[PDB]
Ligand binder design. Sequence first.
Ligand SMILES: Nc1nc2c(ncn2[C@@H]2O[C@H](COP(=O)(O)OP(=O)(O)OP(=O)(O)O)[C@@H](O)[C@H]2O)c(=O)[nH]1
Ligand SMILES: Nc1nc2c(ncn2[C@@H]2O[C@H](COP(=O)(O)OP(=O)(O)OP(=O)(O)O)[C@@H](O)[C@H]2O)c(=O)[nH]1
Ligand SMILES: Nc1nc2c(ncn2[C@@H]2O[C@H](COP(=O)(O)OP(=O)(O)OP(=O)(O)O)[C@@H](O)[C@H]2O)c(=O)[nH]1
Ligand SMILES: Nc1nc2c(ncn2[C@@H]2O[C@H](COP(=O)(O)OP(=O)(O)OP(=O)(O)O)[C@@H](O)[C@H]2O)c(=O)[nH]1
Ligand SMILES: Nc1ncnc2c1ncn2[C@H]1C[C@H](O)[C@@H](COP(=O)(O)OP(=O)(O)OP(=O)(O)O)O1
Ligand SMILES: Nc1ncnc2c1ncn2[C@H]1C[C@H](O)[C@@H](COP(=O)(O)OP(=O)(O)OP(=O)(O)O)O1
Ligand SMILES: Nc1ncnc2c1ncn2[C@H]1C[C@H](O)[C@@H](COP(=O)(O)OP(=O)(O)OP(=O)(O)O)O1
Ligand SMILES: Nc1ncnc2c1ncn2[C@H]1C[C@H](O)[C@@H](COP(=O)(O)OP(=O)(O)OP(=O)(O)O)O1
Ligand SMILES: [Fe+3]
Ligand SMILES: [Fe+3]
Ligand SMILES: [Fe+3]
Ligand SMILES: [Fe+3]
Ligand SMILES: [Mg+2]
Ligand SMILES: [Mg+2]
Ligand SMILES: [Mg+2]
Ligand SMILES: [Mg+2]
Ligand SMILES: [Mg+2]
Ligand SMILES: [Mg+2]
Ligand SMILES: [Mg+2]
Ligand SMILES: [Mg+2]
Ligand SMILES: [Mg+2]
Ligand SMILES: [Mg+2]
Lengths: 457, 458, 434, 435
Amino acid sequence: MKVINDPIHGHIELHPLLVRIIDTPQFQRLRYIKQLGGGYYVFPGASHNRFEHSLGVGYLAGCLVHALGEKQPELQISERDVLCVQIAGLCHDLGHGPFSHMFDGRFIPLARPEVKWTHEQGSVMMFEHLINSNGIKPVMEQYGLIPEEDICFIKEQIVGPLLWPYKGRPENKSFLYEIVSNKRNGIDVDKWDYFARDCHHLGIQNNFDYKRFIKFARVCEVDNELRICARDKEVGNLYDMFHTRNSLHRRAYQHKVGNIIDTMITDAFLKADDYIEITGAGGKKYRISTAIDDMEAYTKLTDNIFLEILYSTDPKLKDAREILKQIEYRNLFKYVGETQPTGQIKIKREDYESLPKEVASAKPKVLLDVKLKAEDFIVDVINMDYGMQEKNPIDHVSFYCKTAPNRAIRITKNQVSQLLPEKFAEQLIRVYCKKVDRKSLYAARQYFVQWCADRNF
Amino acid sequence: TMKVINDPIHGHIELHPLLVRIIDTPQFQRLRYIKQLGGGYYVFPGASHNRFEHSLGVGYLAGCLVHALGEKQPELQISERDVLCVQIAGLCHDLGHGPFSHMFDGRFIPLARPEVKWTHEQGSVMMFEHLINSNGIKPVMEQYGLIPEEDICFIKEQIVGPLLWPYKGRPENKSFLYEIVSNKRNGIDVDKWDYFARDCHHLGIQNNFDYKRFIKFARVCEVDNELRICARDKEVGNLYDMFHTRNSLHRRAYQHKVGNIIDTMITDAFLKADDYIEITGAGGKKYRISTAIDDMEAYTKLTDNIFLEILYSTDPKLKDAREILKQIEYRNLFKYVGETQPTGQIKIKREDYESLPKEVASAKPKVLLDVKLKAEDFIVDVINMDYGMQEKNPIDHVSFYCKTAPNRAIRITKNQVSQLLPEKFAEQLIRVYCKKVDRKSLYAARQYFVQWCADRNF
Amino acid sequence: TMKVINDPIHGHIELHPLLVRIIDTPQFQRLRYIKQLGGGYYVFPGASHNRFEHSLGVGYLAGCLVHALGEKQPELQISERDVLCVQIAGLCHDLGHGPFSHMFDGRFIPLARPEVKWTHEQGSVMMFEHLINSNGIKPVMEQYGLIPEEDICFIKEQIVGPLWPYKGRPENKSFLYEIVSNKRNGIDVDKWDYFARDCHHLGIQNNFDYKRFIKFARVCEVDNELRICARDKEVGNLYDMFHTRNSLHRRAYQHKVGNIIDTMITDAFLKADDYIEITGAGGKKYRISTAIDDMEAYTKLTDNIFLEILYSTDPKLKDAREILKQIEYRNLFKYVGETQPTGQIKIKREDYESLPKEVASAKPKVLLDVKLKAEDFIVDVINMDIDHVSFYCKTAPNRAIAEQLIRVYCKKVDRKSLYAARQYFVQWCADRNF
Amino acid sequence: TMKVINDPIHGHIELHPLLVRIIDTPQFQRLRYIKQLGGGYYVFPGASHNRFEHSLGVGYLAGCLVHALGEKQPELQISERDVLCVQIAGLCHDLGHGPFSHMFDGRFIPLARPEVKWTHEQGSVMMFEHLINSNGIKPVMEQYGLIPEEDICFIKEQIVGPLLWPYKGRPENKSFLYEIVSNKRNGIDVDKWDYFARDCHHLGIQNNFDYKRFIKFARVCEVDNELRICARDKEVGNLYDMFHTRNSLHRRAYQHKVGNIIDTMITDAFLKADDYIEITGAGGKKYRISTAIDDMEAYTKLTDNIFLEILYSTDPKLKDAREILKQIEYRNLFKYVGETQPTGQIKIKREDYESLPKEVASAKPKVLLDVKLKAEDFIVDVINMDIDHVSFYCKTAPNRAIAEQLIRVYCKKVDRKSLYAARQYFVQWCADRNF
Ligand SMILES: Nc1nc2c(ncn2[C@@H]2O[C@H](COP(=O)(O)OP(=O)(O)OP(=O)(O)O)[C@@H](O)[C@H]2O)c(=O)[nH]1
Ligand SMILES: Nc1nc2c(ncn2[C@@H]2O[C@H](COP(=O)(O)OP(=O)(O)OP(=O)(O)O)[C@@H](O)[C@H]2O)c(=O)[nH]1
Ligand SMILES: Nc1nc2c(ncn2[C@@H]2O[C@H](COP(=O)(O)OP(=O)(O)OP(=O)(O)O)[C@@H](O)[C@H]2O)c(=O)[nH]1
Ligand SMILES: Nc1nc2c(ncn2[C@@H]2O[C@H](COP(=O)(O)OP(=O)(O)OP(=O)(O)O)[C@@H](O)[C@H]2O)c(=O)[nH]1
Ligand SMILES: Nc1ncnc2c1ncn2[C@H]1C[C@H](O)[C@@H](COP(=O)(O)OP(=O)(O)OP(=O)(O)O)O1
Ligand SMILES: Nc1ncnc2c1ncn2[C@H]1C[C@H](O)[C@@H](COP(=O)(O)OP(=O)(O)OP(=O)(O)O)O1
Ligand SMILES: Nc1ncnc2c1ncn2[C@H]1C[C@H](O)[C@@H](COP(=O)(O)OP(=O)(O)OP(=O)(O)O)O1
Ligand SMILES: Nc1ncnc2c1ncn2[C@H]1C[C@H](O)[C@@H](COP(=O)(O)OP(=O)(O)OP(=O)(O)O)O1
Ligand SMILES: [Fe+3]
Ligand SMILES: [Fe+3]
Ligand SMILES: [Fe+3]
Ligand SMILES: [Fe+3]
Ligand SMILES: [Mg+2]
Ligand SMILES: [Mg+2]
Ligand SMILES: [Mg+2]
Ligand SMILES: [Mg+2]
Ligand SMILES: [Mg+2]
Ligand SMILES: [Mg+2]
Ligand SMILES: [Mg+2]
Ligand SMILES: [Mg+2]
Ligand SMILES: [Mg+2]
Ligand SMILES: [Mg+2]
């Protein structure tokens, strides 16, 4: 057994199978993908990658399954179950692209709007390619795993079911599907891991305490299926969890300067495409947008490409190059304004492309010498929620009492406190102007105020 | 001749000779034997800190804030006298605390002497006067440039309210100096900053607020013909987070059920042990626990020691009280029965609690069980949660400013921040305990409690 | 059932019902009012912790270490009875401190009753016996699978020392006797808790990493008997331990002002004795120095005594009380001199009253007009004691491969008398060859 | 306007607009892509920080110390231009680092061009001159009250050494300003405090030094006729603790068994990859990895990207180097053979680095050697292992004052019998030459 030293956790022990899986090009590719993407250009201490995040998530999944097993010997938890859960926690982010959430957040929807792609599909495909190429099946068989069923069990833990829709484990082990990714209420070890790590690196103090949560967790057989349950004295702690998630999102992840830097990087990638060449299986050639359909080509697509565009000399990639150079001089797109949040005038994705035009067509009352077209405006729509899209995540949790540990109850928002939030979803709209001269900024402000007053925000 | 003292929360804090002179007095050293969280030490074993270090840290933070404000804007004309007066006020702002701190003025004085209104800030002012008079600090203050006649009143008005522009210590143009140690318009000051960090450090909990950023982004504005401190308009969410952290601390630690019941038992022991404890004051007169607040010589000798004085006693007269304390040693506490759902903070006035238990004894449950319980077998506790105004939003009383127009102060409404902010800012709670340990009486008390709750439609 | 307690240093500590039963007794709760550093609270404001949390943490650490050792080597045959016994021994290892902790048995008893030899470990054993017999704990232990007769002896031997002398356990469990306390090399959980808590409270960065130590801890046979071993690579690991120990002892435990305040407190206690009465077993009245002969009276001896002297009004206590007042104005005794750490004369706690008399009797070579008696001199004796361990190599997991300081203080603080007292000290040192 | 940046180590840092103008340049921004440790990132997962934050923190600490010294001793005649100059010097002290930091100038250049002596401080000075002359900073400096020539010389002399008063930036009166950023006499400077704090925070190791106490108690006192930084006589334990922490870091992190091996593998891959990688410089001329240090416009584009340029290549000419990198991706690392002779009785010089594995093969063991070795299978590591002169001052007298070599050898051939033979060759190499 190896021993690795994590600054966040203590010393992590690794099963030999995990060491075998980690020493592959597919997993080692994560050393060159940043956790927070463009936010590194606002918080200089955020230089961590996904390698340590995956290590920590696997460690925490193993710890949680062990703690659950050693308190209730009637659940019949074996070592192969722990190994499968740890492997699933280890290989849950294999499909991330350059700059992490930017790519599948901004680049793929724009370059190829006819495909529905998420990084979990990429993670599953990467896992399959890794297992097939590196020949891990005999090693798995050596350590007491059954590839035929355990591979599907691991796959379903990452994406979901691909009555009882799962095929990896029976209903008796239903509580094993709510550890790495919870589809019901969103309480899992991923949140704990990146809360701790991001708070450590960014320079902000963390508020949640997951060890206390592990101390009070149980399996209380909710609605004909075994599920993980909490004590009824920890509702406020879960509300605090979600509050700190929201605070992190509004302080760091949705910083407007970081968002505009990400937008500029996406523009550079869009302009530089059709000229970058990537080699895949069979000697075929791919692009940045089309590399997601070949994993041998996807394996060679990391944050390196950024610099490949900055240091290039080809006159064909000149335009994109210029944009990146601006990022190195801090000649960024300027910020004009935003609109107050609203929970009932939602804007769908399909309308995003039409937003800039609406701002360009607004006619301010006072005549202005400067005239701005529809290509001088960037409109960004931000969605803030608790993860359930206007629903209350805490209303899908099951609680038990000290007197009757094996009986599940439900707690309503009115039985906790009157100081809890009245809503659980909102949006924001931000406007940026590409032109940097003062007159253009004044004009953009006039158009923005006219457009906002017209639509009554 | 400036001293250096090391604090585990802050770094190494430097002390002026005048502060060193003031600290080396019995009236200030008395704070070494008064616990901060009181009865909460019996639930959180790490909470053994006292008020001495709290006062030191508050004075240090007040000095730092004044120094930063003077650094940013030279036109404010802040002299050394102002800084030293603010530091002294921060030092002597909690001199009037009694045994187990809040518990005393929270529970004991209102019961033993219900005909008087007493707050520990009045005690702090009286103790400060007694300290200055006894220790002869006036010439020492004069030798360092202070004017006792005006500066003493300035410090007094800093500690308490003003008792048309009502203050007298300074002129109006320095009015921003009155809202550093204690703020009355809202609840932003350095006391909260100090004890948030201290309590989180000692209770094994993580703090969420960062006051250094707030110091980085503070200014002085001329709002309503008054000079007052402003934060920049991008810090609204941080202030909401500050108040959320305050509420979280209150609900997790300060209002713990077992801590509250232990405090109630200690108050009962003190109430029963009175009339048999004599305290010597000025002139050789003898005082009591509830009467010592009328004489500072007797109040100086009243600390947590009295607790143990009742535990180790041998007089037959103090038997009853002694028994109660012994029950705390074996952990035979009053048993939790029930709690009521939250409502607004104004539903039961102060002059109603005495009637609450009797009502629970007047309920007749449908089952109509045996083991009748009298009105003396029930304890009813009323808890009030709020953001500091008990009905209002403190953020509505904060002046902001913008980068483009730093000298112009504005106001930000709740609807302009977010839609996930709390709907209300006040809350009330009721808890019921039973003074019995056998299971049958607990089940009976549960039936009475449910009948009462379903009878007043809470 | 299991009870969870939050610790600022460690995480959430789980307590067995037997430990909860032991904790909820007056004898254990007495530890809430005895401070750890003692007189160091008046130099470092943040050091206000007591021995209650220290005992809790030591028990937690001992249990964790035993559990890890038993889990990583199932051939040692460690049962849950041994884990419970070790946890109990760690829990009740410091029941014998008096007021202000190490000062009392270090400074008060020798100066009060020179003919009596007493350590706080004997007090801990006696108080453990009193706690067990006075609260009816034996049936509770029998209810959880323990054998009281042998287990009580096992715990006592874990607290105090005894061709193998121990009788609590057989010869093949010799590694269980060096967890709570180790007199050979000094690797034990008591010191780990000391280091962690003191560094956290005082504000001094710690350097030892005990989790790493527990990670690579094995039991390998040495000298035909089992001992706890350490991997070869962990040589810089168990050097931060000694560096931190030296740093703490130099920076905090031997600070001049703290020692002076301890000296003043002991002087006030000595003057106060013969007037404070404490009720013991049967109603008999004891004294501060004599209370250690009865545990009924010893249970009520805490830091409270301090304030009892300070707030008194009886005219018989005007002297001791006066001394304490000088602490409250920072009118402390005055440092004069220091002398040999060589140890030529390793002064033991049999003649401490004579030392100031010896200093006074010394006649300086140069005549000094100011005369000083033996009532205005104090002698503070600071008795401070790599001891090497048995390592083990990777390829062979089953194979293995004191000073003293004396300071002198002058009660008189006028410069003229201090000048002469400085001259007396050098003559005394020359006479005693220090 | 002042600009605030958040550092997890130091809190919130204010930057003067001149520093903000210096920072927002490509020559400073290339530091975002060079790692603090290099190979150590492959043993400690949490050591992924770069030199950008290190430079920021060093500048912050230097400014703080200068301000404190000037404030507590007003007779030292410390102006504001001096504070700005010290901050700039601290900001641009590591501007000349190459890929993977100390591995480059310490290991790659000697093995590639032994005829050239080069340190990264010369690179830092050259890059500072390039940045200033290329980004038009001189008028901006003149705008804020600085004289370009004297201040430029002062900063350069603060970075490099003297370049009986050998300095020219400041007179003999300001002799204490030259030991804040870099101090080669004893080794007490902010550059090392930042190293200690950041490395302990990231790796997980905990340090014991407390630099705030040192700054509080530090003063400036006359020693040997010159003004010098002096510490109170009670700081002896703290200084010993500082040295102990430095020793612990060096023996536990910077000299780990596997990090050095990975560094040697990376250097071998780079050496094989040379002669085929082209870098464009001034005037369109193409340079090499070894010769890029002769031009700064080409040196600007030399970062840790080269690694990924070789690993993700398709040119057959780079196959050999590529293969080596692939081994690092499978943990098929070179093995450990032997280690010998601390204290450097010879103190090897850089010029001999590319001759050591020739004497190892030269040695002829008397034992039976059926398997033969050659001067390719051996890699030589020359890992270096490196109380002081402190002028203390007593409380009662405020104004009165009162390193070894190491060698290791690895075998590229990882066969059991080949490893056995290599373990013999080394013994005769060390015994013949008196190691
Ligand atoms: N194997 C491996 N170890 C890593 C990795 N990242 C960090 N480490 C740590 O670095 C240490 C070095 O291990 P190895 O590279 O296998 O070196 P080694 O211990 O001499 O190899 P063995 O002799 O086979 O045990 C490990 O113990 C890990 O704790 C990684 O990606 N793979
Ligand atoms: N004066 C004083 N110092 C305290 C107190 N609490 C902690 N300390 C610290 O303890 C240290 C001891 O200082 P002193 O008691 O005055 O002894 P000293 O260093 O010899 O000072 P002098 O006798 O005046 O020269 C101080 O430097 C403080 O930092 C306190 O209540 N009063
Ligand atoms: N029993 C006990 N708990 C303590 C003590 N000190 C701190 N605590 C903590 O305070 C909490 C209060 O527990 P109890 O005093 O037993 O109150 P309770 O939970 O209502 O009692 P039960 O209903 O029997 O569980 C415990 O869970 C401990 O974690 C102590 O000395 N004894
Ligand atoms: N200028 C600059 N800021 C950085 C850098 N790295 C992190 N930051 C921080 O990121 C924040 C945002 O960068 P800015 O360029 O100032 O964006 P901005 O505040 O909208 O620009 P201004 O309106 O001119 O103030 C800054 O306040 C810095 O604290 C950097 O390399 N350069
Ligand atoms: N003193 C230390 N404190 C904390 N982490 C450490 C320390 N020494 C090493 N580490 C890191 C290095 C690795 O990330 C992990 C363990 O490595 P380490 O024990 O040195 O393994 P190794 O590969 O050198 O030895 P081996 O395989 O021979 O046991 O912890
Ligand atoms: N090494 C240390 N690290 C941190 N805090 C310390 C250290 N030594 C002492 N302290 C604490 C003790 C006091 O709380 C505060 C200042 O004490 P210290 O500087 O030792 O004064 P002192 O009384 O010994 O000397 P003096 O008054 O003669 O300068 O710092
Ligand atoms: N939210 C919290 N975070 C951290 N520590 C807490 C929190 N609430 C309580 N603690 C502390 C108090 C005690 O020291 C320890 C356990 O207390 P707690 O969980 O409240 O038990 P309890 O005795 O009140 O409940 P019960 O008997 O119902 O289980 O943890
Ligand atoms: N809430 C926060 N807590 C801690 N650090 C923060 C927070 N918000 C931002 N930071 C970081 C981001 C930068 O590293 C640094 C300053 O950022 P910030 O205050 O947002 O400046 P800015 O450039 O966006 O605003 P402006 O130009 O309007 O003053 O602090
Ligand atoms: Fe994740
Ligand atoms: Fe306060
Ligand atoms: Fe102990
Ligand atoms: Fe540096
Ligand atoms: Mg290994
Ligand atoms: Mg994911
Ligand atoms: Mg998810
Ligand atoms: Mg001192
Ligand atoms: Mg107050
Ligand atoms: Mg207040
Ligand atoms: Mg309980
Ligand atoms: Mg002991
Ligand atoms: Mg800005
Ligand atoms: Mg350097």
